[PDB]
Amino acid sequence: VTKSSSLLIVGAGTWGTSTALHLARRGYTNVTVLDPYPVPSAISAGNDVNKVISSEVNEILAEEAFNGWKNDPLFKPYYHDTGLLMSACSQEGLDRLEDPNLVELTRPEQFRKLAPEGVLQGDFPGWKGYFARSGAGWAHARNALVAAAREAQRMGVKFVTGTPQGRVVTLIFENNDVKGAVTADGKIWRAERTFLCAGASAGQFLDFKNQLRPTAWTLVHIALKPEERALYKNIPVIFNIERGFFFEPDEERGEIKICDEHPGYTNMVQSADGTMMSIPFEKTQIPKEAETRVRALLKETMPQLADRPFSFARICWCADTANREFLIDRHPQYHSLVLGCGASGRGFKYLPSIGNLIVDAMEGKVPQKIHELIKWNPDIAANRNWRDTLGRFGGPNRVMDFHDVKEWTNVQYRDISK
Numbered sequence: 001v002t003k004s005s006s007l008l009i010v011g012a013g014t015w016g017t018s019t020a021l022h023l024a025r026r027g028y029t030n031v032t033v034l035d036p037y038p039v040p041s042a043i044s045a046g047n048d049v050n051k052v053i054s055s056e057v058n059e060i061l062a063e064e065a066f067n068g069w070k071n072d073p074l075f076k077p078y079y080h081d082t083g084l085l086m087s088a089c090s091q092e093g094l095d096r097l098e099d100p101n102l103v104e105l106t107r108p109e110q111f112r113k114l115a116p117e118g119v120l121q122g123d124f125p126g127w128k129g130y131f132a133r134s135g136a137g138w139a140h141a142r143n144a145l146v147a148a149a150r151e152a153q154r155m156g157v158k159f160v161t162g163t164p165q166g167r168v169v170t171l172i173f174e175n176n177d178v179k180g181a182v183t184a185d186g187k188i189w190r191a192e193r194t195f196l197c198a199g200a201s202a203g204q205f206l207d208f209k210n211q212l213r214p215t216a217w218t219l220v221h222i223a224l225k226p227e228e229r230a231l232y233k234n235i236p237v238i239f240n241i242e243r244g245f246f247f248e249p250d251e252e253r254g255e256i257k258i259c260d261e262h263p264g265y266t267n268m269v270q271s272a273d274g275t276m277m278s279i280p281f282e283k284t285q286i287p288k289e290a291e292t293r294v295r296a297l298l299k300e301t302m303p304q305l306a307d308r309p310f311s312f313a314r315i316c317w318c319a320d321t322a323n324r325e326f327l328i329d330r331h332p333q334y335h336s337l338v339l340g341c342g343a344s345g346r347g348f349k350y351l352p353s354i355g356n357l358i359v360d361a362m363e364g365k366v367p368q369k370i371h372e373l374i375k376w377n378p379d380i381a382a383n384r385n386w387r388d389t390l391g392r393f394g395g396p397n398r399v400m401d402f403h404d405v406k407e408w409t410n411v412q413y414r415d416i417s418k
């Protein structure tokens with residue numbers, strides 16, 4: 001492997017793009033990224049108007065990520081240090097999650113005062129939590145993803161996007177190694193190293209030995225009237241581990257993005273084999289139960305918006321490892337394959353930095369203690385509890401399945417790939 005080696009990245013999502021960017025920064029000149037959707041991909045979990053950005057191996061990686069948001073001029077424009085409320089309703093939730101910038105809240109009036117009067121009109125019944133006044137906030141996830149991809153491209157990376165030209169249909173398996181990939185147009189992409197960064201779809205392409213559970217969450221937007229927008233500007237991110245979270249309205253459309261908290265949805269599919277796999281799919285709607293949960297959250301916080309029609313809704317997929325640690329490693333058998341996946345529903349904040357760790361994995365530079373946590377680890381996924389809620393709360397307090405969903409929302413379509 002040399003700086004001019006053919007390198008192939010499967011997936012131009014959060015981590016594929018971070019990888020492309022960091023390969024280019026570190027001087028690689030022959031990188032190609034494949035994706036079935038134009039950047040920003042409509043199925044990328046990173047393609048969102050906002051994500052929560054906050055802030056031991058996890059502390060090291062989180063520190064590097066946050067440093068990118070604060071100090072890397074490519075990423076700085078997208079980060080808003082609004083502060084963040086982290087709250088819960090039960091002791092179990094509170095347990096789950098001297099700093100001068102952290103305050104405890106236990107009283108409804110304290111919650112209401114986190115925003116200008118007229119914004120947080122709710123009763124916050126039994127809400128208790130911690131408010132970080134700074135050093136946490138939100139990033140414009142889609143704009144940051146696009147910025148990173150365009151900077152990678154500027155530095156020589158070739159993005160081949162859209163279907164069929166960017167849709168990988170198989171990796172090239174030759175003499176027990178991965179030699180590249182083949183796209184749906186029937187084009188062979190040979191590479192000295194292949195990075196698998198297909199997020200929730202990564203399991204399509206090889207046997208992860210139960211290490212990945214593709215799992216989906218839910219989001220909506222509510223459009224504020226032009227007059228009512230100013231009042232909601234610069235509010236801190238409001239997050240309750242057992243209810244959901246929301247952000248100040250975006251600029252483009254004055255839309256407040258809201259997520260209901262729950263342990264997620266799988267889509268378990270039965271093969272002729274009889275084996276069981278969670279298979280992701282695009283849907284620009286959410287289950288009716290998710291709508292209900294969103295509206296119950298709004299009742300408790302911004303009741304004046306609780307009955308407003310949604311302007312956009314979608315499911316959003318990631319993939320959980322058995323302990324929600326990342327899966328970033330060289331494959332133990334396929335010498336040329338590098339995994340950059342298992343973001344476990346928490347990978348967006350690592351956009352500025354995770355590509356460095358993935359490249360380090362390819363190059364054999366990962367510190368041993370870090371490697372031990374993120375390595376290929378089938379032992380951890382043996383006898384897997386696929387219904388493990390993995391520290392997630394809300395709604396049914398169980399992992400549910402889309403096969404059980406009877407009714408979906410019927411919100412207007414929007415093409416978020418532009």
Ligand SMILES: Cc1cc2nc3c(=O)[nH]c(=O)nc-3n(C[C@H](O)[C@H](O)[C@H](O)COP(=O)(O)OP(=O)(O)OC[C@H]3O[C@@H](n4cnc5c(N)ncnc54)[C@H](O)[C@@H]3O)c2cc1C
Pocket residue numbers: 010011012013014015016034035036037041043044045046047050051052053166167168169197198199200201216217218219259315316317318340341342343344345346347348349350
């Ligand atoms: C609703 C929701 C809320 C979240 N909240 C936060 C948060 O507040 N903060 C945070 O840090 N994280 C959050 N996350 C987690 C974060 O979004 C993800 O962990 C991260 O974006 C996943 O990155 P990834 O690169 O693994 O996958 P993705 O960004 O999803 O990218 C995968 C790419 O693989 C591509 N692909 C699929 N099939 C093929 C194929 N056949 N060939 C080639 N490419 C293919 C897709 O088109 C996609 O672009 C949230 C996620 C969701 C869904």
